[PDB]
Every structure is written in structure tokens, then in C-alpha cells.
RNA sequence: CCUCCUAAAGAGUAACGGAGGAGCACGAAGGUUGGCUAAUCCUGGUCGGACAUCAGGAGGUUAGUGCAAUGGCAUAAGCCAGCUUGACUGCGAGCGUGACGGCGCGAGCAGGUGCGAAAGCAGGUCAUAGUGAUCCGGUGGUUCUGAAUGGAAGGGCCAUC
RNA sequence: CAACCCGAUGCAAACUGCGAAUACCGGAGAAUGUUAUCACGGGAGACACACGGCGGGUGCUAACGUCCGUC
RNA sequence: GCCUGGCGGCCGUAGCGCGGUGGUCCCACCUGACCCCAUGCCGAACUCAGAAGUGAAACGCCGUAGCGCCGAUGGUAGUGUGGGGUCUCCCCAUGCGAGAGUAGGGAACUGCCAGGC
């Protein structure tokens, strides 16, 4: 499955980051949406999460999952994850090739304040 | 054996050198590939390898 | 997308009613022609193939993919590596533009043809066929050429089964036979 | 006349039997010969027993052999000091213990068998006993 | 004949069974070759060249069994 | 010298016990980053033949590890490609293993590197064989010594044959 | 005639999808033990062991045989 | 609370097979592709810009026991200590007590965030 190969294609980093035990910024992509949540070291609880399926964000959006969309998200991710205190983390591209809408929201969260 | 021994001298005037081997036959060209000699305290090219 | 349009056009509906397909998706879609042209020998010259490749390219505009040997286990030869092929699957536009190159001016440009064997069933409308010889279709001043040629041609349709494969592909005047 | 066509290893160690077989009750024919004793079949015996066994039931009926040699067992020549590598595999033994159902008759009266095995197990070293078939 | 020869010690085995004092970096489990006879985990890992279960920061030893189809896994909890 | 068994479920162990291997290979077959995943069979397809190549299905470490055997490997240690030289230098908490000489594992520190967007990884190869103490000398470096003083020969120290 | 496969049946020191007793390592605690324990130093002798019980290789599950482990 | 997605916890009583079912919330497939990026050929995958279409496939859920899988109780095997019979094997007291097989169980369970009703 296209989704299957994807997962295993990042299971490594998604373990090495675990090995280190550092709060990571997980990003999930989809044909129509963009997701971003900051899970804790334990990987159990999530500290913050800003996505396109959220009315607030999507409201002032031309089209969800449009790079520009997958950018404002990352910033909101940082905005939130900062007021919460969570500064400096580890980015988990999670299968997707860090290059487009992911090479955004990531650096759109980098410049936003998040350190990594 | 056949795998002849080889010495990698520092490109820098320094006399420090490295040591390793190589198949004189198969690969004709002499090995060049940088390294770090304590003296200059800096990385640099290393030549000479038959 | 010439022939392509025909699909979504008169085709489909026909196949639709053919077995009242539950959805406009349960409609077996033509999925990429494949081609291949077995190199053969190669070792002998390892030259005619670079040509045979250019010949494979003659038809499908896409650049040929010189297929390398595999298992190596070959009374023939094969040393794991070594050259021995040129497949080149067919994609959308070129998939139908080519499906507008034959079944019209290639298959018809016969050599005898008294009925194309409608026997290539499998379990996915998977239909493959060998041409036995470069039909001399729009190559390049096709006269000097090289000794014979031939190749393979698979359809690999999304047909749920050859119990439908036959149906589709027929929506277009597919040679075949009674 | 009966041995493993092939063996990953030329010589089996030695070890020792530890009582209680596994192939107890009959599961093929309808009679058979049981253990009642401990020991090993020289394999050259299983045939000496099988042959005589057959020759009685004649042709009629089906015979079975739930035992097999498979175990090497070497022998060192006469004049030869100790410690010169293990000897050479001279014969092939078949480790059996109390319970192991040696053979198994089927197509024949419980008469032309009880006095066929009794005739058979008389070539064998390990004592024996006749067996019926057991329902359950 | 033509048979004899044989390697030597190469000890290899657990040298830090169950919760131990676990020094700043004891051995724990040598058993070379072993990448999976015992796996690296927790406040200990390393898994040196010869797959020697390292054992980082000092402390009790765990010895578990998790995901990837059972798998041993050696980790060390602090005392 | 290495592998398995004997070796009695920690280590360790004998025989002229049962079996095999090593005296190497590699500037990539090392490092990193991105990606990939086999054997086998079934059906269909020009020349394609039991078995080259193409399609689909089944299957799931039965493949593949540079070379023995054992353990291990999908997060692959298997396979492909880009950029590369960490096959760096000085050290090293703390350990394992040895009668000893000695061998092995090692996080982390300092200086400098390569790859990655980054966390990060890299002090050679999936690991375990692939080796020779000492002496006597050979080569290069160094202002350590230099038999009245300055030099030099010789000696020391580091690299190395 | 017979490969794979299904069912039923055995065998394995160098088979294991199972798996003890127990030995071993560590932690806690009472009692008993003339610190039995550890380290450093003065002095040694000894490196031909034999039989018996248990687990084994070798031999013929021969030997007051032979070679290991253990009491 | 029900449904979906993301990250996990446990890793087969969690898996597979079979039958059914769900859609502009979500998810997919899906449309377009000069481009960012990509094919040792291919927009298949990777990637971008997104309509129109469909739950077919995939995925999720529901049921079903055909197969995996879990699995007692009893007995059996072995074994530490003490004793005994004894030609290479057993037996008794005692503590421990399998493996397989049988009864049976079984179509996972759960935490955190988000979105829809
Ligand atoms: Mg041991
Ligand atoms: Mg190796
Ligand atoms: Mg033991
Ligand atoms: Mg002596
Ligand atoms: Mg002695
Ligand atoms: Mg002795
Ligand atoms: Mg004696």
C-alpha cells in the first residue's frame, strides 16, 4: 500500500528520535489537508497541534494543503507550541520528502520561533 | 599478500605521513585523499600511493 | 487523448450496462501497455541491442529501459548483470496515442492476420501479445534496418478479471477473431 | 539391508536409551509386535524378522515396520591401538525401547499372525508381545 | 582422520544479569554476533562493533521483551 | 588462529574425539543521506529454450550477506544512487578477558572533518580468523642528549620498515 | 516409477515453533559460624593421582581401559 | 457517546479467509501537470496545482470459526536431596514438575490530540 511503504520509509527516524527521547514535531500530509502535532518524548501525549481541518485556520485559507496552507499551519504550530513553552524540538518529516508543503510549515515554524 | 604497503605524505610541507596499503596491480593510479596531520592542526590533501 | 475520449465516451456506458457495474469505477480501465522486445544473446555483439533499443524507441517515444539480467542462472549465459532488454511501459497520453498507433495502422498492417487470438486471459484483463516481427511501423526510413525484431505488448487493464477483460478493449475495434 | 540413503553426519555419537517409546498403540495395520524390552535392532535383524514374518502370511495381507536403523554405530578392527579417530561405521542399529511397536500386520486372521510374529520375534534380541488394535 | 582444531574462549555472555549496581558503563551482555540475542535499549545502548550490549549511565538493569516480534532488549533503570 | 558439537540451560574443559575453515579481500565492498526489498511457483506474452526479458497472482526473512561455521539482520547488517575521506589526531569515565606479555568493548572531552533541512551519524567493513614478542638495524621528523667548548657521529623520543 | 502438497508415524551431539530440576549472578532478612572473607607481604610444597556415585566422548554402554565435568 | 484521522501502549484471544456495510466531514482513490520535485523508461512511485467523479480498489467498522492463535484440570516425562534394586537401566520418600494431547477460550483491548454529528 502506498501508505504502507510510506510508514516503513520513516520508521527508522521514528525510532532514532525515540532513542534520543526528544519532543518531536510530527507532520502528516494528505491530498486535501496538512497536519502538525507536537508529541512528547513518551510519544503518548500530545502537547500542541495546529492543522488545516481546524475551522479557525482553514477559515482564512484559500485551499487546505496548498503549501501556503501547509505553512500558516506550521507557524500556528509554533505560535501555540511556545505559549505552551515548548521551544526547540525535532522535526519528523514522517515518510514524506522534506521538499514542498513539508519543507514549509517546517521552516514556516522554524522562522516562526521553533528551534531545530 | 600482493597488497603492497603505501604511505600517504602530507601535501603541506610538514613531514607527517599516513600509512595504508593498496593493490598496485588492479588500480594503477596513486591514491590521493586528504586527512588531518596534528602538526598543521588542520585537514589537508595527502598524496603518493604508487 | 483521442482514443482516450472514446473510453469515457461511448465506451464505459456500454461496459456499464454490460454488467450493470455498481459504480463508474467498477469499469475496467485500460492501464498502460508495456512492450519489452527480448534482446537475446547480446553477449555476441552488445551492439545490435543498443539499436534494438533505438528501435523500441522508434514506436514509443519514451526512452527504452535496457533491462539487465537477474538470477544469473542461465545455461544461455547471464552473469547476474549484463544487458538483455528494453521494456518501456506506456503512460496515459502515450498509452492511448500508441493505442492509436496500432489496432488501426499496425495490427492492420498485417503480414497474414486471419484472426488475432482472443486468448490471453489471466485474472485482471491482463492481455499480452508478441508481434513476432517489427511490423515496420513508422520507424525511420525502414528499409536498411536490422534482422527481424519483434517484441511484446501487454495491456494490464484494471479489469476485475479476464471475465471482463475481453469485454473492454473490445469497446474499440480490437482485431481478435470469431 | 536397510539404511538412511543420506546423512548430514557420518558418525552418530553413542548416548543411551531412556525408556518409554512413542509409537505405542498400533496406528496402521491391526495387530503388530510390541517391545516389552529395551535394546537395539541391528537392522540386519528387522529383515531377518520381516522376511520370516512375511513368509507365513505368504502374500496376503499388509505388513508394517514402525522402526528404523538410522543410527551408525562403528567398530574398530582387530589389531589396532585405541585413539586413532573413531572407527568406521560397520553396521546400522535401530534404537528401540519398551513400547515401540516393531511391526504391524493387518490383512490376515488373528491366528495367521499371532503365529507369524511369534515366529518373527524369535530372530529379534529384545523380547516382545502380540498386540490387538485398541479401539480408543 | 584429518579432524581437530577449534577456536578458543571468546567468553561472550551476560556479565550483568538482572538489576545490578550497573557502573557508569559496565559490560552487561557480551555475547558477540548477537544483534538480536539481546538488543540495545533505554539508558543503555551502545551496541559496540562486536554487538556488545554497552550499558550507559549507571544503574539497575532491566532485561525486557517488546515490539518487533518478541525481541529481548536490555535497558537500565536508575536505582 | 577462527566456527559448531562433545560441554552436564552463567564462564570455563580432555582425547591421535566428530566436522569445516584462515595466513586474505575492499579507496570502495569505507562514511553519510535519499530511496528500495528477495527465493520459488502459477497463468499470460515474438524470437524465449525447464530456466534469459515483460505482465499479473500466489508466496513471505524458503533470498541476500566478498570467503568457513555459528549467532544476527526489514529500523535491515541485504540493494540502488548522490555527495564524500570518521579507515581522522590527542585522550578516555568504566568494563570484559587473561598467570603474565597482552587482547577486546567503550560513552564522553579537545582540535579539526564529511553527509543531512534537522535530531543526528561516522575513530573503517554484520560480528567473531586473515598473524610474529625481543633484539639488531634501515628510513623520516625533532634544536631531548651530545665525554674540554661549538658543532658532528652516535644515543633518546614520535612515526615507520 | 515418483518430486512437491495433505493426512497419519518415528529419529537427531553438530534440528528447535516448546522447555524444566537446578546450577550460577544480584538484592533483602534472621540465626549460627573461635571473621570462615578480601588485600599486602615472609616461607612452601605441588604440577605422575587412584578408586566409587552421577553426566559424557572413546572403546564392545569390554577392561582394576582411556580422556573431560562434578561430589 | 458514535464515526474518522494522527501518535502511540501492548504484539496473533491482536493475524488471515469468508460474507456485509461506510463517503465533500475524514480518508482515500480521483482531475490537471509547463512547472517545484521525480522516472537508470513511466506524474506508477516521488511532487505540485486542484475541479468534476466513486466508495470499485485500499482503508475502517459489523458478523462468521474455515485456519492461525491462546489454552486449563488430570495423568505422563525429567529432576535436586535421602535411600534402594541393579550388567549398559530403574524403583521408593520428598520438593520441583514439563512437552504434547484433551476441555475449553477466541473475530483484541487501551491512552493522548484533532475533526464531524
Ligand atoms: Mg556454558
Ligand atoms: Mg565478515
Ligand atoms: Mg551448567
Ligand atoms: Mg608437568
Ligand atoms: Mg599431569
Ligand atoms: Mg584426572
Ligand atoms: Mg582408571
UniProtKB/Swiss-Prot annotation, chain A:
<dbReference type="Pfam" id="PF00861">
    <property type="entry name" value="Ribosomal_L18p"/>
</dbReference>
<dbReference type="GO" id="GO:0022625">
    <property type="term" value="C:cytosolic large ribosomal subunit"/>
</dbReference>
<comment type="function">
    <text>This is one of the proteins that mediates the attachment of the 5S rRNA subcomplex onto the large ribosomal subunit where it forms part of the central protuberance. Binds stably to 5S rRNA; increases binding abilities of L5 in a cooperative fashion; both proteins together confer 23S rRNA binding. The 5S rRNA and some of its associated proteins might help stabilize positioning of ribosome-bound tRNAs.</text>
</comment>
<dbReference type="GO" id="GO:0008097">
    <property type="term" value="F:5S rRNA binding"/>
</dbReference>
<dbReference type="GO" id="GO:0002181">
    <property type="term" value="P:cytoplasmic translation"/>
</dbReference>
<comment type="similarity">
    <text>Belongs to the universal ribosomal protein uL18 family.</text>
</comment>
<keyword id="KW-0597">Phosphoprotein</keyword>
<keyword id="KW-0687">Ribonucleoprotein</keyword>
<protein>
    <recommendedName>
        <fullName>Large ribosomal subunit protein uL18</fullName>
    </recommendedName>
</protein>
<dbReference type="GO" id="GO:0005737">
    <property type="term" value="C:cytoplasm"/>
</dbReference>
<keyword id="KW-0689">Ribosomal protein</keyword>
<keyword id="KW-0694">RNA-binding</keyword>
From Swiss-Prot, chain B:
<dbReference type="InterPro" id="IPR001705">
    <property type="entry name" value="Ribosomal_bL33"/>
</dbReference>
<keyword id="KW-0694">RNA-binding</keyword>
<protein>
    <recommendedName>
        <fullName>Large ribosomal subunit protein bL33</fullName>
    </recommendedName>
</protein>
<dbReference type="GO" id="GO:0046677">
    <property type="term" value="P:response to antibiotic"/>
</dbReference>
<dbReference type="InterPro" id="IPR038584">
    <property type="entry name" value="Ribosomal_bL33_sf"/>
</dbReference>
<keyword id="KW-0820">tRNA-binding</keyword>
<dbReference type="InterPro" id="IPR018264">
    <property type="entry name" value="Ribosomal_bL33_CS"/>
</dbReference>
<dbReference type="Pfam" id="PF00471">
    <property type="entry name" value="Ribosomal_L33"/>
</dbReference>
<keyword id="KW-0687">Ribonucleoprotein</keyword>
<dbReference type="GO" id="GO:0003735">
    <property type="term" value="F:structural constituent of ribosome"/>
</dbReference>
<comment type="subunit">
    <text>Part of the 50S ribosomal subunit. Cross-links to the P and E site tRNAs.</text>
</comment>
<comment type="similarity">
    <text>Belongs to the bacterial ribosomal protein bL33 family.</text>
</comment>
From Swiss-Prot, chain D:
<feature type="modified residue" description="(3R)-3-hydroxyarginine">
    <location>
        <position position="81"/>
    </location>
</feature>
<dbReference type="GO" id="GO:0000027">
    <property type="term" value="P:ribosomal large subunit assembly"/>
</dbReference>
<dbReference type="InterPro" id="IPR020798">
    <property type="entry name" value="Ribosomal_uL16_CS"/>
</dbReference>
<dbReference type="InterPro" id="IPR036920">
    <property type="entry name" value="Ribosomal_uL16_sf"/>
</dbReference>
<keyword id="KW-0379">Hydroxylation</keyword>
<keyword id="KW-0687">Ribonucleoprotein</keyword>
<keyword id="KW-0689">Ribosomal protein</keyword>
<comment type="subunit">
    <text>Part of the 50S ribosomal subunit. Cross-links to the A and P site tRNAs. Interacts with assembly factor DarP(YjgA).</text>
</comment>
<keyword id="KW-0488">Methylation</keyword>
<dbReference type="GO" id="GO:0003735">
    <property type="term" value="F:structural constituent of ribosome"/>
</dbReference>
<dbReference type="GO" id="GO:0002181">
    <property type="term" value="P:cytoplasmic translation"/>
</dbReference>
<dbReference type="GO" id="GO:0019843">
    <property type="term" value="F:rRNA binding"/>
</dbReference>
From Swiss-Prot, chain E:
<dbReference type="GO" id="GO:0005737">
    <property type="term" value="C:cytoplasm"/>
</dbReference>
<dbReference type="GO" id="GO:0000049">
    <property type="term" value="F:tRNA binding"/>
</dbReference>
<comment type="subunit">
    <text>Part of the 50S ribosomal subunit. Cross-links to the 23S rRNA. Cross-links to the A and P site tRNAs.</text>
</comment>
<keyword id="KW-0699">rRNA-binding</keyword>
<dbReference type="GO" id="GO:0002181">
    <property type="term" value="P:cytoplasmic translation"/>
</dbReference>
<keyword id="KW-0694">RNA-binding</keyword>
<keyword id="KW-0820">tRNA-binding</keyword>
<dbReference type="GO" id="GO:0000027">
    <property type="term" value="P:ribosomal large subunit assembly"/>
</dbReference>
<dbReference type="Pfam" id="PF01016">
    <property type="entry name" value="Ribosomal_L27"/>
</dbReference>
<dbReference type="GO" id="GO:1902626">
    <property type="term" value="P:assembly of large subunit precursor of preribosome"/>
</dbReference>
<dbReference type="GO" id="GO:0003735">
    <property type="term" value="F:structural constituent of ribosome"/>
</dbReference>
<keyword id="KW-0687">Ribonucleoprotein</keyword>
